[PDB]
Design a protein around this ligand. Structure first.
Ligand SMILES: [Zn+2]
Ligand SMILES: [Zn+2]
Ligand SMILES: [Zn+2]
Ligand SMILES: [Zn+2]
Lengths: 579, 335, 124, 109, 449, 88, 48, 54
C-alpha cells in the first residue's frame, strides 16, 4: 500500500494528468497511455507502461453545460456518479470544487482551470480528497440528491413547455343551391357536404359524381333521379349476389356431407351428372340422390345431419368456456416457463389421455380443447428442442401420406393429420457438420497406415490409398479426443486398433472382405491377432517408446484395448468396399 | 430508496381503433402491464404514477400491418438501492459449495450474493432470514429482470468512523433541499413511535457497537432509545434541530463533525467540535456542509429503516429466537 | 413459363429465394423495378415484395449507443453488449440482406452506429 | 489545448422533440388530399378494418377496400394527415394537422 | 416490450480494440470446428455467435435459424496487426509525427486555413525526411513502403534501415495526443491508435454459412504458433521464423479482408455484389413469368392469365363479419375445385393450417386469413424487362383463362405501348398482390389508366 | 431537373462519382451504391462521416423503405373523433 | 444502361416537398417543380 | 423418380421430379463412370405438340 500504486490508479481518468521532470524523487508508471504536461510546458503523451517521474498533479475543473445534464436526464439511465460529475462540471452542483482547493499556491499556469499540487505531502492530501470525492459520489448520499434534482428539473422543463406555453360565415346563393343539392344527394350517393370557404371539396364531390352541371344549368333533378336509379340497381345486384352465394354455400355443404357419408366414388359420379347438366352448386343434388343410387331417406338423413352440424357449429360459436382463453395464453410464446404451467393447467381438462388420431375434448364444456401435437410441440419448445429435433419428433403426427400424390401445388412443409396445422418445413439438408475437426498428423496417419498394408492380407484387391484415407478419417478425430512422441504413439495405437477392428469385422460379417495377417489363418482367435499386433507395434516403434520414459508395455496394451473399444463404439463393424 | 422518476418509451398498439376509445385508460393499463415490477434504465419500477406527455397515435410506416405506436413520457415511483445499505429481511435460498444466494422480503426486490469465504457468513442455514450489509459496489439493474442483483454480507457493526472538516455552510435553498431529508426522518421516526418499545430497545441494544448491559430509556421528546457510552465531557448535538436552526440561520455549522461508534446512530444527534479531539485513524475529509449533512441524514435514514424492518419482520419471540445463532455471532464481535 | 409459391428454397447467406426456375426459387425484382415502383409511388408494394416476400425481418437497435441489441419475447432477453445497464431497445423493420451487409462492414473494422429517430411528444 | 473526449460529447441518442402544430389559420399546405395521401388513408383504413372491422358505415360491403373507400368518400374515416414541415435544431418539430373529412378527395368512384 | 423505431442517421467510424472487445460475445481460443454434431465452444463455429442450422439454436439470443442474425466474436491476437483497409492512413500518420516523442513535425498552424478533410493529406504530402524535432532532438527518418506487399513499412535514417513491426507502430501512435489529432483535422474517434489491432473481430456465423471459414481457421491456427509473451522493440533483431510467421498472419488477415480488391470486401462491389444484387435488387416469392401473347378480346386494362398459374398464386383475405359469406365458397372448394383455397391462417392457434388436412369445420372463425385462388377481376402487377419508363409496371384486371392448354400471358395489342413489348417471344413478369395495403394501392395508384 | 441539379452549387457538377461527391458529400450509402463501395466506405470511416437517411438508396441499403409517395405524409389516429363516435 | 443508372443515382434524391419545391433533404434544387408546379400527365396544348 | 439414401438410421437423399408437365420414363440404365462406380441415368421424354406460345 505504498503511495506509488495510489498515484497509479489516480492516472486512469482523462482528468489529473502528469507534469514530469527528469530530476525528482517520485516515480510511478501508468496503466494505459497518458497525455501529460512538463516543465517548460510541452504537451506530450506516454505509452501504457513507462517510468515517469511526478513533479506534481493538476485536476482540471471541466466546465460542462446544463444542456448536457438535461440530455442525460432525458436519457434517464445514467449512474449517479456520472450525473453528479457532469452536474459539478456544469455548475449545477458544488461538490468537486469543494473537495478540491487544497492548492499550495498558484505555482504553475496553463489554459484550463484546475487545482495544482506540486509538493510531497499536499499530493497525498490531493489523493485523499480525490478518493473521498468519488467515495461520496458513489455512496448512498449524492444519489438521492442528484436523481431528485434531475427529476425536478425535467419536470420543470415539462411544465415550461406544458403550462407556460400553449372562419367562414355564409356561402352564396349559387353555392347555397349547390349545397342543397349535395344535402339531398347525401342520402343517395357517397357524398357528404362540408362548409369550407374555398368550395373545393364540393367541386371534387361534383366531379367524382360525374355531374358538374349544377353550377350553371338548373337540371339537378334529372341527376337526382339518375342517382336514385343507380342506387336501386346497385342494391338489386347486391341482394341477388348474396342470395346466389348463400345458395352456393349450402349446396357445397350438402355435397361435402355427401362426400363424407357415401364415399368419393358416388359423390364424384353425381358431380359428373350435375356437371353435364349446368346445375352444379344448386340443391337439386338432393333430388338426384333421391332418385339415383339410393333411397330418399338416405338423403333426408343427409339434410338433417347438415342441420345438426350447423347447430353444433352455432353452439361452438356460443361457447364462452374458460379453456378457450387459456389456449390463447398457450399460443403467445411469452416466457416458456409460463407456457409450461399454462399447459399444466390445461392438461387437467383432458378426458381419455387422447394420445393420437383425434382431438382432446374439454370436460367442462364438451368441445375440442387441444390437439396432441400442440401439447408435444409445447413440451419440446419448453424442453430446449432444436428445429431438427422438433421436426423429426413431430413426424408421427404427419398429415396425409402418398394417398394424395400431389394437389398440383408444390409444398415444402408437413402438416398435422389431426387438424391440419403446419408441423414444420423441410427444403434441403443442412450438411454443414460434414467438416468435423495440420497436414502433418494426417500425413503421418496416412503414411503409417500405408506401411501397415505390408503385413495385412486382403482376400481381394483393395485400393490401398482409399484404405489409408478411411483410416485417417476414423483415427484422426479419435486421436484428437485423447509433435511430441506420445501423440505419435497414440496415432500408431489407433491405426493398429482400427486394423484389429477390420479383422474382427471380417470375422463377424461374412459379407465383408476377409482381412487377415500374412501367415495367420482367417479363423485365428482374436487374442492371437492382438498378440501379433502388439509385438509388431512394440518392435517397429521401439525408438519412439524409448523416448517416453513413463510408458510401459502394460500402458501400451491398455491404451490399445481402449482405442479398439472406442473405434468399435464410434464406427461399429466396418467393411472395405459380385462380379 | 423509494423515489419518483421520469421515463420515456415507445408502445406498440395492435388495434389503434379500440385503443383510441379510452387513450388514457389503455395507456396506463399497458404501461402497468409492461413496466411494473421490472428493472429498466438503472432502476426498478414499482408503480406508474401517471403520464406527463404523450405522442399522437402514429401508424407504423415501414410495414403493411396497419398497426400503431405511441411515444409515452411517464412518471413512475421506482426504487434505487445504493451501496452500504441495510436490508433487515434476506431469506437464504441457496447455500452450496460455491456461492450463497439470498432473497429480500422488503419493498426493494433484490437478490443478495453473499461470498462464502468469511467466518460470519460461511455457516448458516437454508430458510433462515438475516439482515444483510451491502458492499461498496453498485447494485446491478439488468434490464427486464424481476429483481436487482447486488452483492452483500451479514451486517456486523464496525469499529471505525469518519471525521468531516466543514468550512462552508448552507444557503436557504441548500437547506430547503434537506427539508425533504428531515421530513423522511420524521416520518420514519413516527413509524418508530407507533410501535412498542421492547423489541425497539432489544434490537438497538444488540446492534450497539459496544456491550450495553445497563438499561436506560434516554428521551429527547422526539426520539427514544437506550443510552450507551459517552466520550469524556463531550455532549452530542441533535442534527435535526441543528439543521432546522441553520435554516433559521441562528447557528454556524463549520468545524469537525463525527459519528463515533459509541454514538446512538439511529438518533438524530452527532458530534461537532471546533478542533478534532477524536482519535481517528483516518485523515479528516475536507468538504462543505452539503456532503456531511446528506451523508449523516442518509445514515440516519438507513439505520431507522433497518430497525423498523427488523421490528416489522420479527413479530414474536419465536422469530427472534429461531435465528439466535446469527445474533450470537453478533454478540461475539462487540467490544 | 414459371410460377412458384408463397415460400420455398432460401439462400443461406442473404435469406432471399434462390435464383430462377432451375433451383425452384423465386424471380428477381431487380434494380430497375424498384426505380419504377418508387417513381409510381408504390411503396406499400415494395414492402410486400422486397420485405414480406423476400427477406424482411426485425432488427433490434439500442437507442443509447446505436449498436444492434438482443431481444426475445420468450425466454426474456433484453440486453445490449455496449452499455448493458442503460439499454433502450427499439425494433426497426429491416431485411436480412441489410443486416448481413452491416455485419460485413463491421468485419472490416468499420463501426456502424444507427441513430434511431428521436421520440416526439405533444406539448401538453 | 483540445483535450481528451468527455461524456458531454459522444452521445448517440438524439434528443427528444416537441410537436409544434401550426394553427389552422396559419397553414400553407393545400386543402386537397394528394393521390398518395388518399391511397395511404384508404390502405390504412382497409387494413385496420381487416384487423378490427368496427365501422359506422350505413351501407354494407363485403371487402375492406370498398368500406375504406366509402368511408373516405362519406367523410367518416377516423384518421388524420400530419404533414411534417420542419425539424428545428432547438428540438421543435413543426407539422401540419389536416382532417381528411374536410378536404377534397382526388379519387374517383 | 421493444417499441417501434426508425433509423434517422448512420455514423461511420474506425473500429478499435475496445469496440471489438465490447461488441464481441465470445473469445475464440481453439481451432477445432465441431465436437460431434454440435459446434465446439471456443471455436470459430461456436453457437454463441449465431446459428445457421436446424440442429441447434443460438446460445446468445435463443432464436432459431431464421430469427438469429448472428453475433460477433473476439480473437485476441498474440501480436498486433495492422488494419488492412486503412494502411494508407497509417502511412500518413507515420509522416507527420516524430517516431521518438510523438509531437508533430510539421507546423499545425500552417494547415489551419484548410478544411479538416484535407489537412492531414496536404500536411503529409510535403517531404518530412530529415526534419529535426523541436522537443526531443531527433531526426525524422523516411517512411518507405515495401514494394513486395501492401502492409510492410521500413524506416530509412540516411541508409540505416529498420522494419516497423505493428507493435512498434502502436507504440508510436499511442504517444500522440488528441490535440494533434484535432488540429490535424481528424476527429477524436479517428485517433491513429485504433489503426493497429490486437483483438480482431470474428464475423458472425450468419455471414459465413457452411472458404472464408477456411481463411479464419488458417489465421487462428497460425496465430496459435506465435508466442503469447512476444515483445517487439525498435532496433531489436527478430528470429526469421517469427518474422515469417508475422508476415503470414498479416497476409492472411489482409486476404481475409482485401484479397485482390475470397474476401469480405469482394462481396460488395460489382453487379453480383451485395449492394446491387441483395439490397438494390431482390428475389421474391408469389411471382410468375411466361411468354406474352396477343388477344384482341381483352380490354387494355386486362391481362389473360392461365388458370394453372391462378391456382398457384394466392390472395390473402382476412375473415371478418362482412366477407364471411363471400369467402365461404372459396373455403369449401379447397384444392379440388376452382375457385378454391389452399391455406388458412388461424388467430386461435397463431399458426398455419392446410385445407386438405382440415375438413371438420363447418365455417371459419372471425379473424382468420384465407389464401384463396386468383379469380377474374383481381388486380395484378404486370412487368417487362428492362423497366425504362415508369409505365413498365402496371396494374391490370386479371381474366383467368379456363383453357388448360394455354400457358401464355395474353393482353390486348394496344396495351403493348406501355411496356414497349411485342409478340416475337418476349416474356413478362406478373405478381398478384395479396396484402390489403398493397392491393389498395394497386387499384388507386398503379392502375394502367 | 438535369440542369437545376447540375448547377445548384454554383458550378456545373457531373452525373458521375465526382459530381455526386460534390452535391452530396455526406450521403455515403448512396455514394457506396453508385460506383465503388470499398473506396467510399474507407473514406467515410476516417472522416467520421455522419449519414442522414433520406432519398432512396440510403433507406434501401439499411433495409427500410424511402419516405416517398404514400410514405411521405404519415397518418395519425383521430383521437377526438373515435372517442365520441366509436365504442370499446 | 450505363447512362441511365448514373442519371438516376444523381437525381433520385430530388423529391417534391410540401411547398412544391424540389430539394435534397434540406437543400433546394428547384424553387418550384418545373417552374410551374404541374404534372407532366396533366398538360394540354393550347394556342394563344 | 430415383431412390437414394445415405447410411448414417437412414437419411433420404432422394431425387424428385420437379416439373409441372408430366413426363414418361423412356430409358433407365446403370452405367459405370470413369471411377468404376455405379451412377443412375434416366431419360424422360415429353410428347410436345405445337401449342400457344411456341
Ligand atoms: Zn371448455
Ligand atoms: Zn446499448
Ligand atoms: Zn443469435
Ligand atoms: Zn521528436
Amino acid at each position: 500500500p505504498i503511495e506509488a500504486y495510489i498515484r497509479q490508479l489516480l492516472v486512469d481518468p482523462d482528468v489529473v494528468p502528469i507534469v514530469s521532470e527528469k530530476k525528482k524523487e517520485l516515480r510511478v508508471r501508468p496503466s494505459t497511455r497518458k497525455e501529460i504536461f512538463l516543465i517548460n510546458g510541452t504537451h506530450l503523451a506516454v505509452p501504457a507502461e513507462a517510468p515517469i517521474e511526478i513533479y506534481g498533479l493538476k485536476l482540471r475543473l471541466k466546465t460542462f453545460s446544463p444542456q448536457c445534464f438535461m440530455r442525460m436526464a432525458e436519457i434517464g439511465s445514467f449512474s449517479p456518479e456520472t450525473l453528479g460529475y457532469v452536474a459539478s462540471g456544469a455548475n449545477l452542483t458544488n461538490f468537486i470544487r469543494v473537495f478540491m482547493k487544497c492548492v499550495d499556491q498558484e505555482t504553475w499556469k496553463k489554459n484550463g482551470e484546475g487545482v495544482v499540487v506540486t509538493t510531497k505531502e499536499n499530493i497525498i492530501q490531493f489523493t485523499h480528497q480525490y478518493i473521498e470525492l468519488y467515495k461520496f459520489l458513489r455512496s448512498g448520499g449524492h444519489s438521492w440528491l442528484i436523481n431528485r434534482l434531475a427529476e425536478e428539473m425535467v419536470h420543470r422543463k415539462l411544465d415550461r413547455e406544458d403550462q407556460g406555453s400553449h372562419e367562414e360565415i355564409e356561402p352564396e346563393e349559387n353555392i347555397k343551391r349547390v349545397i342543397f343539392f349535395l344535402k339531398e344527394l347525401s342520402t343517395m350517393y357517397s357524398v357528404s357536404p362540408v362548409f369550407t370557404s374555398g368550395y373545393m371539396p364540393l367541386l371534387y364531390d361534383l366531379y367524382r359524381a360525374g355531374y358538374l352541371e349544377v353550377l350553371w344549368n338548373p337540371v339537378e333533378q334529372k341527376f337526382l333521379q339518375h342517382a336514385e336509379q343507380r342506387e336501386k340497381e346497385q342494391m338489386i345486384l347486391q341482394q341477388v349476389d348474396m342470395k346466389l352465394t348463400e345458395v352456393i354455400t349450402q349446396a357445397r355443404q350438402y355435397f361435402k356431407i355427401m362426400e363424407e357419408k357415401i364415399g368419393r366414388v358416388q359423390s364424384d359420379a353425381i358431380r359428373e351428372i350435375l356437371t353435364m347438366e349446368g346445375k352444379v352448386d344448386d340443391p337439386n343434388s338432393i333430388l338426384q340422390e333421391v332418385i339415383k343410387a339410393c333411397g330418399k331417406q338416405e338423403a333426408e338423413l343427409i339434410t338433417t345431419e347438415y342441420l345438426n352440424i350447423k347447430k353444433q357449429w352455432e353452439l361452438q360459436e356460443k361457447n364462452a368456456c374458460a379453456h378457450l382463453k387459456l389456449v390463447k395464453q398457450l399460443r403467445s410464446g411469452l416466457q416458456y416457463a409460463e407456457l409450461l404451467k399454462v399447459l399444466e393447467s390445461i392438461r387437467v381438462l383432458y378426458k381419455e389421455k387422447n394420445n393420437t388420431t383425434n382431438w382432446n375434448l374439454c370436460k367442462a364444456c364438451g368441445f375440442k380443447l387441444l390437439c396432441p401435437h400442440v401439447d408435444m410441440l409445447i413440451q419440446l419448445q419448453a424442453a430446449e428442442a432444436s428445429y431438427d429435433t422438433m421436426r423429426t419428433k413431430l413426424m408421427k403426427f404427419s398429415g396425409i401420406n402418398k394417398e394424395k400424390e400431389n394437389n398440383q401445388g408444390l409444398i415444402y412443409s408437413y402438416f398435422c393429420k389431426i387438424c391440419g396445422e403446419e408441423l414444420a418445413h423441410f427444403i434441403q439438408e443442412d450438411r454443414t457438420a460434414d467438416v468435423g475437426i495440420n497436414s502433418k498428423l494426417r500425413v503421418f496417419i496416412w503414411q503409417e497406415t500405408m506401411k501397415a498394408c505390408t503385413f495385412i492380407h486382403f482376400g481381394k484387391l483393395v485400393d490401398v490409398k482409399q484404405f489409408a484415407n478411411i483410416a485417417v478419417n476414423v483415427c484422426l478425430p479419435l486421436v484428437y479426443s485423447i509433435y511430441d512422441p506420445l501423440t505419435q504413439l497414440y496415432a500408431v495405437i489407433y491405426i493398429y486398433a482400427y486394423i484389429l477392428n477390420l479383422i474382427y469385422s471380417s470375422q463377424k460379417n461374412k459379407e465383408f472382405l476377409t482381412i487377415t495377417i500374412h501367415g495367420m489363418k482367417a479363423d485365428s482367435s482374436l487374442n492371437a491377432y492382438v498378440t501379433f499386433l502388439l509385438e509388431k507395434m512394440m518392435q517397429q516403434y521401439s525408438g519412439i517408446i524409448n523416448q517416453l520414459s513413463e510408458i510401459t508395455d502394460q500402458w501400451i496394451a491398455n491404451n490399445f484395448r481402449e482405442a479398439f473399444k472406442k473405434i468399435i463404439h464410434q464406427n461399429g463393424l466396418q467393411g472395405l468396399s459380385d462380379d | 430508496m423509494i423515489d419518483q422518476k421520469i421515463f420515456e418509451t415507445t408502445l406498440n398498439i395492435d388495434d389503434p381503433t379500440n385503443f383510441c376509445t379510452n387513450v388514457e385508460a389503455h395507456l396506463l393499463k399497458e404501461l402497468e402491464n409492461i413496466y411494473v415490477g421490472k428493472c429498466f434504465k438503472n432502476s426498478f419500477i414499482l408503480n406508474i404514477t401517471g403520464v406527463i406527455q404523450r405522442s399522437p397515435c402514429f401508424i407504423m410506416r415501414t410495414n403493411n400491418s396497419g398497426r400503431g405506436y405511441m411515444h409515452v413520457r411517464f412518471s413512475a415511483v421506482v426504487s434505487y438501492l445504493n451501496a452500504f445499505d441495510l436490508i433487515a429481511a434476506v431469506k437464504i435460498i441457496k447455500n452450496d459449495s460455491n456461492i450463497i444466494l439470498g432473497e429480500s422480503l422488503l419493498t426493494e426486490p433484490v437478490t443478495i450474493v453473499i461470498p462464502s469465504s468469511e467466518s460470519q457468513n460461511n455457516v448458516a442455514e437454508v430458510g433462515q432470514i438475516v439482515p444483510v450489509q451491502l458492499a461498496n459496489s453498485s447494485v446491478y439493474y439488468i434490464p427486464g429482470r424481476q429483481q436487482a442483483s447486488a452483492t452483500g454480507s451479514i451486517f456486523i457493526p464496525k469499529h471505525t468512523f469518519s471525521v468531516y472538516h466543514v468550512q462552508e455552510e448552507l444557503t436557504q435553498e441548500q437547506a430547503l433541499n434537506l427539508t425533504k431529508l428531515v421530513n423522511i426522518i420524521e416520518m420514519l421516526l413516527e413509524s418508530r413511535s407507533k410501535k412498542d418499545f421492547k423489541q425497539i430497545c432489544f434490537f438497538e441494544k444488540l446492534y450497539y457497537t459496544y456491550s450495553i448491559s445497563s438499561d436506560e430509556i434516554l428521551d429527547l421528546k422526539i426520539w427514544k432509545g437506550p443510552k450507551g457510552k459517552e466520550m469524556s465531557r463531550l455532549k452530542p448535538c441533535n442534527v435535526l434541530s441543528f439543521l432546522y436552526d441553520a435554516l433559521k440561520n441562528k447557528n454556524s455549522s463549520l468545524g469537525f463533525w463525527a459519528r463515533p461508534p459509541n454514538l446512538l446512530k439511529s438518533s438524530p444527534l452527532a458530534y461537532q467540535q471546533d478542533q478534532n479531539s477524536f482519535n481517528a485513524t483516518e485523515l479528516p475529509i475536507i468538504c462543505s456542509a452539503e456532503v456531511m449533512f446528506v451523508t449523516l441524514l442518509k445514515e440516519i435514514i438507513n439505520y431507522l429503516q433497518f430497525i423498523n424492518d427488523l421490528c416489522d419482520t420479527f413479530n414474536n419471540e419465536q422469530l427472534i429466537k429461531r435465528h439466535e445463532n446469527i445474533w450470537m455471532l453478533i454478540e461475539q464481535r462487540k467490544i | 413459363r414459371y410460377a412458384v409459391a408463397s415460400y420455398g428454397p432460401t439462400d443461406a447467406l442473404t435469406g432471399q429465394p434462390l435464383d430462377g426456375k432451375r433451383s425452384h426459387g423465386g424471380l428477381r425484382l431487380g434494380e430497375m423495378e424498384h426505380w419504377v415502383l418508387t417513381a409510381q409511388g408504390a411503396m406499400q408494394t415494395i414492402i410486400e415484395k422486397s420485405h414480406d416476400d423476400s427477406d424482411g425481418c426485425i432488427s433490434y437497435i439500442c437507442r443509447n449507443c446505436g449498436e444492434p441489441a438482443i431481444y426475445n419475447a420468450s425466454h426474456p432477453i433484453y440486453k445490449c453488449m455496449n452499455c448493458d445497464v442503460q439499454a433502450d431497445i427499439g425494433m426497426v423493420d429491416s431485411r436480412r440482406s441489410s443486416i448481413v451487409f452491416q455485419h460485413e462492414m463491421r468485419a472490416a473494422n468499420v463501426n456502424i452506429t444507427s441513430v434511431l429517430s428521436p421520440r416526439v411528444f405533444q406539448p401538453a | 489545448i483540445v483535450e481528451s473526449p468527455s461524456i458531454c460529447e459522444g452521445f448517440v441518442q438524439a434528443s427528444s422533440q416537441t410537436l409544434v402544430i401550426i394553427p389552422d389559420n396559419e397553414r400553407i399546405t393545400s386543402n386537397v388530399l394528394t393521390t398518395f395521401e388518399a391511397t395511404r388513408l384508404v390502405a390504412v383504413r382497409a387494413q385496420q378494418l381487416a384487423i378490427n372491422g368496427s365501422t359506422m358505415l350505413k351501407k354494407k360491403y363485403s371487402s375492406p377496400i370498398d368500406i375504406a373507400k366509402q368511408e373516405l368518400f362519406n367523410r367518416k374515416i377516423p384518421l388524420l394527415v400530419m404533414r411534417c414541415i420542419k425539424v428545428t435544431p432547438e428540438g421543435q418539430k413543426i407539422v401540419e394537422i389536416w382532417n381528411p373529412r374536410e378536404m377534397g378527395i382526388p379519387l374517383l368512384d | 416490450e421493444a417499441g417501434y423505431a426508425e433509423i434517422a442517421a448512420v455514423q461511420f467510424n474506425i473500429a478499435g480494440d475496445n469496440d471489438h472487445k465490447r461488441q464481441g460475445v465470445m473469445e475464440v481460443t481453439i481451432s477445432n470446428l465441431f465436437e460431434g454434431t454440435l459446434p465446439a465452444e471456443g471455436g470459430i463455429y461456436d453457437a454463441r455467435m449465431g446459428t445457421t442450422d436446424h440442429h441447434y439454436k443460438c446460445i446468445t439470443c435463443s432464436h432459431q435459424r431464421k430469427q438469429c442474425m448472428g453475433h460477433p466474436g473476439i480473437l485476441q491476437m498474440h501480436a498486433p496487426v495492422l488494419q488492412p483497409l486503412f494502411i494508407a492512413e497509417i502511412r500518413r500518420w507515420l509522416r507527420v509525427i516524430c517516431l521518438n516523442c510523438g509531437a508533430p513535425i510539421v507546423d499545425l498552424k500552417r494547415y489551419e486555413h484548410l478544411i479538416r478533410p484535407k489537412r492531414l493529406i496536404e500536411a503529409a504530402s510535403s517531404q518530412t525526411e530529415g526534419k529535426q524535432c523541436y522537443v526531443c532532438k531527433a531526426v525524422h527518418p523516411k517512411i518507405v513502403k515495401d514494394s513486395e506487399d501492401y502492409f510492410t513499412f521500413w524506416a530509412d535514417q540516411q541508409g540505416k534501415i529498420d522494419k516497423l513491426y505493428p507493435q512498434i507502430i502502436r507504440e508510436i501512435f499511442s504517444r500522440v495526443t488528441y490535440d494533434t489529432v484535432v488540429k490535424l483535422g481528424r476527429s477524436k474517434n479517428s485517433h491513429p491508435e485504433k489503426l493497429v489491432l490486437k483483438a480482431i473481430q470474428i464475423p458472425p456465423i450468419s455471414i459465413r454459412p457452411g472458404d472464408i471459414n477456411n481463411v479464419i481457421q488458417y489465421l487462428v491456427r497460425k496465430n496459435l504458433l506465435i508466442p503469447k509473451d512476444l515483445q517487439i522493440v525498435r532496433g531489436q533483431k527478430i528470429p526469421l521464423n517469427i518474422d515469417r510467421n508475422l508476415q503470414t498472419i498479416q497476409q492472411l488477415y489482409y486476404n481475409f479482408l482485401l484479397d485482390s480488391v475470397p474476401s469480405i470486401m469482394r462481396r460488395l462491389p460489382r453487379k453480383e455484389g451485395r449492394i446491387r444484387k441483395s439490397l438494390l435488387g431482390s428475389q421474391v416469392w408469389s411471382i410468375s413469368r411466361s411468354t406474352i401473347c396477343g388477344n384482341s378480346d381483352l380490354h387494355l386494362d386486362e391481362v389473360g392469365y392461365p388458370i394453372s398459374f391462378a391456382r398457384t398464386l394466392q390472395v390473402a383475405e382476412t375473415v371478418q363479419h362482412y366477407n364471411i359469406n363471400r369467402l365461404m365458397p372459396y373455403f369449401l372448394n379447397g384444392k379440388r375445385q376452382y375457385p378454391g383455397c389452399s391455406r388458412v391462417y388461424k388467430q386461435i392457434t397463431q399458426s398455419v393450417h392446410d385445407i386438405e388436412g382440415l375438413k371438420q369445420d363447418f365455417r371459419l372463425e372471425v379473424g382468420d386469413i384465407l389464401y384463396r385462388d386468383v379469380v377474374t377481376g383481381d388486380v395484378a402487377f404486370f412487368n417487362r424487362q428492362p423497366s425504362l419508363e415508369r409505365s413498365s409496371i402496371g396494374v391490370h384486371r386479371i381474366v383467368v383463362l379456363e383453357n388448360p392448354k394455354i400457358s401464355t400471358f395474353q393482353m390486348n395489342v394496344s396495351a403493348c405501348a406501355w411496356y414497349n413489348a411485342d409478340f416475337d417471344g418476349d416474356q413478362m413478369n406478373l405478381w398478384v398482390p395479396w396484402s390489403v395495403m398493397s392491393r389498395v394501392e394497386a387499384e388507386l395508384l398503379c392502375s394502367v389508366r | 431537373m438535369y440542369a437545376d441539379l447540375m448547377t445548384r452549387t454554383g458550378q456545373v457538377t457531373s452525373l458521375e462519382k465526382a459530381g455526386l461527391n460534390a452535391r452530396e458529400p455526406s450521403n455515403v450509402l448512396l455514394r457506396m451504391a453508385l460506383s465503388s463501395p470499398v473506396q467510399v466506405l474507407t473514406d467515410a470511416a476516417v472522416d467520421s462521416a455522419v449519414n442522414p437517411i433520406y432519398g432512396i438508396a440510403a433507406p434501401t441499403l439499411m433495409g427500410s423503405v424511402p419516405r416517398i409517395g404514400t410514405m411521405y405524409s404519415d397518418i395519425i389516429m383521430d383521437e377526438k373523433y373515435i372517442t365520441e363516435n366509436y365504442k370499446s | 444502361g450505363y447512362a441511365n443508372r448514373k442519371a438516376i443515382f444523381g437525381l433520385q434524391s430530388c423529391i417534391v416537398d410540401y411547398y412544391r419545391r424540389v430539394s435534397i433533404d434540406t437543400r433546394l434544387v428547384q424553387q418550384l417543380y418545373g417552374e410551374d408546379g404541374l404534372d407532366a400527365r396533366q398538360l394540354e396544348t393550347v394556342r394563344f | 423418380i430415383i431412390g437414394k439414401v445415405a447410411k448414417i438410421k437412414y437419411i433420404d437423399r432422394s431425387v424428385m421430379y420437379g416439373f409441372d408437365e408430366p413426363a414418361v420414363v423412356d430409358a433407365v440404365m446403370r452405367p459405370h463412370g470413369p471411377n468404376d462406380e455405379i451412377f443412375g441415368l434416366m431419360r424422360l421424354r415429353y410428347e410436345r405438340n405445337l401449342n400457344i406460345g411456341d
